[PDB]
Amino acid sequence: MYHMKAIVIAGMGFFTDAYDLFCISTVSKLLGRLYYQPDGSTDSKPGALSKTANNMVIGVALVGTLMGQLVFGYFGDKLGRKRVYGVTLILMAACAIGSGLSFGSSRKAVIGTLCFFRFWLGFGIGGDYPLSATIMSEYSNKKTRGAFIAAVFAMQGVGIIFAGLVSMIVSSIFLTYNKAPSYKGNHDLSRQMPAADYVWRIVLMIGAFPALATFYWRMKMPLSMEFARRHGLHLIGTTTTWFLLDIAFYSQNLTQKDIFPAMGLISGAAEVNALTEMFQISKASFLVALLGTFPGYWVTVALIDKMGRYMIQLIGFFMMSMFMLAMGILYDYLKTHHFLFGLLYALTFFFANFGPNSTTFVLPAELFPTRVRSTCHAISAAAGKAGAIVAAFGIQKLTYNSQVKSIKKALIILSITNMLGFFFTFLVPET
Amino acid sequence: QMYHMKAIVIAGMGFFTDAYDLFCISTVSKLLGRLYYQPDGSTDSKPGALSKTANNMVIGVALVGTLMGQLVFGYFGDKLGRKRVYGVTLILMAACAIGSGLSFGSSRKAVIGTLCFFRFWLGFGIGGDYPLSATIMSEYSNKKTRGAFIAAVFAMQGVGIIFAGLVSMIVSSIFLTYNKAPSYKGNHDLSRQMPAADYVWRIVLMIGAFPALATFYWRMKMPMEFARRHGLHLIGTTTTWFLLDIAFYSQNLTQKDIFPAMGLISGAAEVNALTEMFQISKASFLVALLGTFPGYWVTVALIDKMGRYMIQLIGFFMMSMFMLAMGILYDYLKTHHFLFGLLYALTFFFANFGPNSTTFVLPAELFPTRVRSTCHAISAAAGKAGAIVAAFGIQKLTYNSQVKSIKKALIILSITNMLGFFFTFLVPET
């Protein structure tokens, strides 16, 4: 009756991963409104990060996480479980706080420090294996095995919820004291710079506390011809089914500052303050993740073994594609109604969480002989991190601050990617 | 053999990094004042500088933190494993050295608050782990030569002051080559050299992480009746360390406030923000090279033959006489600058050739093991209290630059050193 405590101690590594990677989307507008907005000519919406700057700020963490995964996986055998667990976690608390500090006042200095201190955030987020180190080693007892792997992976949803929650509470707390007219009013005081300079710092520095909690909760606790013919097709299928999942999940959570302001749920950009828009997007993301992410994880836990591993992934990817095409080709009607689009987004997240989001990393575990299981797991993790990379340095460009045509095109490519993942799923049978 | 002094510097790298971390903030207070406390306008007489309260905090918060650290990894910090406390303090040192170079914003209030907080915790990391208690101190190799290496490793503190001056000078010179601007009189805005000063001070403050990391790497590779019997020596050692530390820190921290009054640099409202910092760093580096350092060398050359008692006595006496001569003949130091340079250098020299190598071993050879650790703890606490009153006291008098204030500071420091000379007699040598 107290095993959920154990699941939290197991999945705090994913909790911090989620509220280290998805805490930058709620403040990415602010980092442009404050430091990247010229104080003159007031032409468009409040000036935000440029396409290159936004892509970089979003994706240095994922570049660092892929680098950390590779380096700490190919060199993490001379040491481990304490010396690769007190290093990455301490990094994810030192450079996490450093991400909230600046080397100056220039917009190329604060952004430079932020990118530099998020690269090492990714470095920690990388070679630190959250569950594959502990749970995947045995996977035994044949009693809620998948229902426990999914149970401890459900903490990613809690991480996203907590990211949205801390952003929302910080924005509301700092907003109550300072009220300023919208950007349509005083084009200079809308930035609220003296106080708004200490919100994207608090939101980004709070992420160190989960790293400390994980550190404390874990300190006190006690390729040849043979494999090519055996599982070569299985290996490529397992890698690609995950590579085509991060491209759809990280592009769904990392583009949360563009889709809603285009259609409802948000007051756009140039009719609210700096803090006000941040609070609005934080509330939108938090509500969508609460309705979409967490119930998906719970249903996966409840029905992982009743359904299995083939049919669940198949239906998850097919419904990915169907609901995404609905969110696509029927774009105008969703811009008309501010509720059908929200329902569609929530169900996309729900079927992501219920679908292959919590299954792709288990395929390497329950496949291949133990002689090479670690190598295939590492290569699949590399494929997934490359998927995240192309999610952040990819479709993100196709969506950011663009017209209606570009957003619809990006949704079309995302639906095509999910359908391609659906075709590639029929390569890893479960008996 | 090179391995002898190699092991000496390896053991004393803790003193080196402590000294550098404590004294890197002396040469950049003027840069901070000219950067953040000089508003765009209202230029009347001289470039804006740190407020007296703000400067006192920025200077002495590190010493307050080191007193707190000596208390914490002190009275209730010994019973957690010497490796654990050493590593915790040693990595906190580097973390706060890095954090000191970063800001929580752009306003002067935010930068000052972040600097003060991170310097507080840097001093807190400095304190508690005495760089000499856990080391070879236990091997009391009789009386002869027993203090020889103990004083020899103390030269790392002088080397640390030298390197503080050297790094400040190097970074200021490097940044001055690519950033040339007219002086403060010629122009009141470009004199700051804002987009280069804001980085030179951060870099020179952040450099202090490297010595802490090197020390961590080196150290990680390691395996009532007495109250009445020894009370007089107890009060003697605490008062002597208190007076030595107040004199030493009022002499080291207050160098940026002594030179511009009576030479050795190009005034205050005559040079750029980086050029003034470079000049102050060069002056401090020279006074630490031809001043402090060979004082350490001569003290360790003559520690055993001369002793530790007469050396302390004559060191205090020369402190008093030379500083009194500085105070009385202030007009003559106005006339002649080379004489002032020699006088300051010899003040540092007799500061090193004196109590600076004997007070820190004064608790040793007395206060037997029943209360040895406690006596040393109170003595070090008194010394850091002396440093604190030096930072928040004499520095306040000198910063006013009221001419008579400098003379009053010199007089009170000379009185303090005379008191130290008198109080040296309370402990014998046997």
3-state secondary structure string across B276-339: HHHHHHHHHHHHHHHHHHHHHHHHHHCHHHHCCHHHHHHHHHHHHHHHHHHHHCHHHHHHCHHH
- End-to-end Cα spacing for chain A: 32
Q: In B, which residues are within 8 Å of A102 by CB distance?
A: 102-106
Min Cα separation A107/chain B (Å) = 11
Question: B117 and chain A: CB distance < 8 Å anywhere?
Answer: no
CA distance A244 to A422: 9
CB interface of B with A, residues 125-184, below 8 Å? none
In three-state secondary structure terms, B219 is helix
CB spacing of B101 vs A105 below 8 angstroms: no
Q: Tell me how far apart the alpha carbons of residues B102 and B97 are, in angstroms, rounded to a whole number.
A: 10
CB contact under 8 A, A197 and B105: yes
Contacting residues of A for B99, CB less than 8 Å apart = 98, 101
Q: Residues 6 or more apart from B415 whose CB is under 8 A from it?
A: none
Q: Which two tokens stand for residue A186?
A: 């005083």
Interface test with B, best of A83, A91, A103, A212 (most B CBs within 10 A): A103
User: Coil, helix or strand for A414?
Assistant: helix
Contacts of B104 (CB under 8 A, 6+ apart): A100, A101, A102, A198, A201, B110, B111, B113, B114
Tokens found for residue B188:
């009141």
Residues B120/B388, Cβ–Cβ less than 8 Å:
no
B196: chain A residues, CB-CB within 8 Å: none
Inter-CA distances, B177 with B173, B214, B274, Å: 6, 30, 10
Nearest-CA distance from B253 to chain A in Å? Answer: 26
Question: What's the CA gap between B362 and B354, in Å, rounded?
Answer: 12
User: By the 8 A CB rule, do B63 and B116 touch?
Assistant: no
Nearest alpha carbon to residue B104 among A101, A2, A354, A136: A101
Residue found under tokens 């403050």 = B205
Question: Within an 8 Å CB–CB cutoff, is residue B317 touching chain A?
Answer: no
Contact A103 B199 (CB under 8 A): yes
The H or E element that residue A85 is part of is none
Tokens representing B259 are 């030179």
Determination approach = cryo-EM
Round to whole Å and give the CA distance between B400 and A98.
37
C-alpha A123/C-alpha A91 separation (Å) is 8
Contacts of B198 in chain A (CB under 8 A): 104-105
Q: Give the C-alpha separation, A31 to A109, whole Å.
A: 12
CA dihedral over B270, B276, B278, B280, signed as positive or negative: positive
Query: CA nearest A373: which of A27, A196, A136?
Result: A136
**B208 touches B378 (CB < 8 A):** no
Asked: is A6-222+225-425 a CATH 1.10.287.1080 domain? The reply is no
Give the integer Cα–Cα distance in Å for B197 and B195: 6
Q: Which amino acid is at A244?
A: L
Select from A278, A211, A235, A208 the least CA-distant residue to A25: A278
Query: Cα(first)–Cα(last) distance of chain B, in Å?
Result: 32
Q: Is B199 on the interface with A (CB under 8 A)?
A: yes
Name chain B contacts of A194, Cβ cutoff 8 Å.
Answer: 107
- Integer angstrom CA distances of residue B204 from A150, B96, B283: 50, 14, 17
Write out residues 201-220 of A within 8 Å (CB-CB) of B: 201
For A19, the token pair is 């509220």
Q: How far is B103 from chain A (nearest CA, A)?
A: 5
Chain pair A-B, CB pairs under 8 angstroms: 38
Per DSSP, B150 falls in state H
| CB proximity A197 to B under 8 Å | yes
Contact A46, A30 (CB under 8 A): no
Residues of B in contact with A101 (CB under 8 A): 99, 102-104, 114
* Contact (CB, 8 A) for B183 and B191: yes
Q: Which of A89, A105, A215 to mutate to test the interface with B (most CBs of B within 10 A)?
A: A105
Helices (H), B178-308: 194-206, 209-220, 225-229, 231-252, 273-287, 293-301, 303-306
CA distance A48 to A50: 6
Residues A16, A93: Cα–Cα separation, whole Å: 10
In the numeric block, the tokens 């939290």 are attached to A8
- A127, A87 contact by CB (below 8 A): no
Residue A103 and residue B102: Cβ atoms within 8 Å? Answer: yes
CA angle, residues B12, B277, B387, in degrees to nearest 5: 45
Q: CA nearest B422: which of B287, B257, B240?
A: B240
> Measured between alpha carbons, how far is B316 from B241 in angstroms, rounded to an integer?
12
State the Cα–Cα distance between residues B263 and B260, nearest whole angstrom.
Answer: 5
Note the resolution in Å, 1 decimal. 3.4
Residue B341 token pair = 């340079």
Q: Is A107 on the interface with B (CB under 8 A)?
A: no
Query: Contact B101/B44 with Cβ under 8 angstroms?
Result: no
As a whole number of angstroms, the distance between CA A104 and CA A56 comes to 19
A102 secondary structure, DSSP code: B
Reading the block at residue B397, the tokens are 């008098």
Reported as half-sphere exposure (CB side, CA atoms, 13 A), residue B198 has a value of 20
A chain contacts of residue B102, beta-carbon cutoff 8 Å: 98, 101-103, 113
Ramachandran category for residue B238: left, alpha or beta (phi over 0 → left; psi -120 to 50 → alpha): alpha
Distance CA A216, CA A81 (A): 14
Binary contact (A102, B103; C-beta < 8 A): yes
**C-alpha closest to that of B124 among B208, B65, B63, B77:** B65
What residues of chain A lie within 8 A of the CB of B101, using their CB? Answer: 103
CB neighbour burial string for A401-428, b if at least 16 within 10 angstroms, e if fewer: beeeeebbbbbbbbbebbbebbebbeeb
**Number of neighbours of residue B227 by Cβ within 10 angstroms:** 9
Reduced to 3 states (helix: H, G, I; strand: E, B; else coil), residue B68 is helix
Residue in A103, A197, A198 nearest the CB of B202: A103
Which residues in B lie closer than 8 A to residue A103 (C-beta atoms)?
101-103, 199, 202
Torsions phi, psi for A37 (to 5 deg)? -105, 115
Q: Is A113 on the interface with B (CB under 8 A)?
A: yes
- Reference A91, options A70, A109, A73, A65; nearest CA is A65
Chain B touched by A101 (CB under 8 Å): yes
Cβ atoms of residues A60 and A115 within 8 Å: yes
Give dist(CA B75, CA A47) in Å, integer.
56
Name the DSSP class of B185. T
Closest CA to B247 of B119, B150, B354, B158: B354
CA angle A46/A51/A55 to nearest 5° reads 115
Contacts with A197 from chain B: Cβ below 8 Å: 105-106, 110
Burial of A429 (0-12, 13-18, 19+ CB in 10 A): exposed
CB contacts of B103 in chain A (<8 Å) are 101-104
Q: Chain A closest CA to B95's CA: distance in Å?
A: 8
Is the CB of residue A185 less than 8 Å away from at least one CB of chain B?
no
Unique residue bearing structure tokens 């699941």: A7
CA distances from B213 to A112, A276, B21, B114, B201 (A): 24, 43, 13, 22, 20
How many helices and strands in chain A, by DSSP H and E? 21, 0
Q: Rounded to whole angstroms, how far apart are CA atoms A75 and A353?
A: 32
| Phi, psi for residue B129 in degrees, rounded to 5 | -90, 90
Is the Cβ pair A98, B98 closer than 8 Å? yes
Tell me the two tokens of residue B98.
Answer: 């890095």
- How large is the C-alpha radius of gyration of chain B? 21
| DSSP annotation string for A277-302 | HHHHHHHHHHHHHHHHHHHHHHHHHH
d(CA B287, nearest CA chain A) in Å: 32
Place of tokens 């507008």: A29
The closest alpha carbon to B5, from B300, B376, B379, belongs to: B300
Question: Which stretch of DSSP H or E encloses residue B143?
Answer: none
b (16+ CB within 10 A) / e for B416-427 = bbbbbbebbeeb
Q: What is the CATH number of domain B2-424?
A: 1.20.1250.20
Chain A environment of B117 (Cβ under 8 Å): none
> What's the CA gap between A34 and A15, in Å, rounded?
29
Q: Among B402, B429, B155, B90, which residue's Cα sits nearest to residue B289?
A: B155
What is the distance between the alpha carbons of residues B402 and B113, in angstroms, rounded to a whole number?
28
What are the Cα distances from residue B22, in Å, to A121, B102, B126? Answer: 30, 18, 9
Whole-angstrom distance, CA of residue A416 vs CA of residue A293? 22
B106 to chain A, closest Cα gap in Å: 6
Place of tokens 């804006």: B48
Cβ atoms within 10 Å, residue A226: 12
The neighbouring-strand residues paired with A419 are none
Collect all residues with Cβ–Cβ distance below 8 Å to A405 and sequence separation of at least 6: none
Closest CA to B30 of B343, B325, B267, B337: B267
> A102: which strand partners?
B103
Rg of the Cα atoms in chain A: 21
CA separation for the pair A323, B23 (Å, rounded): 64
Q: CA A233, CA A229: separation in Å to the nearest integer?
A: 8
The residue among B131, B130, B120, B126 whose CA lies nearest residue B89 is B126
Measured distance CA(A257)–CA(A260) in Å, rounded = 7
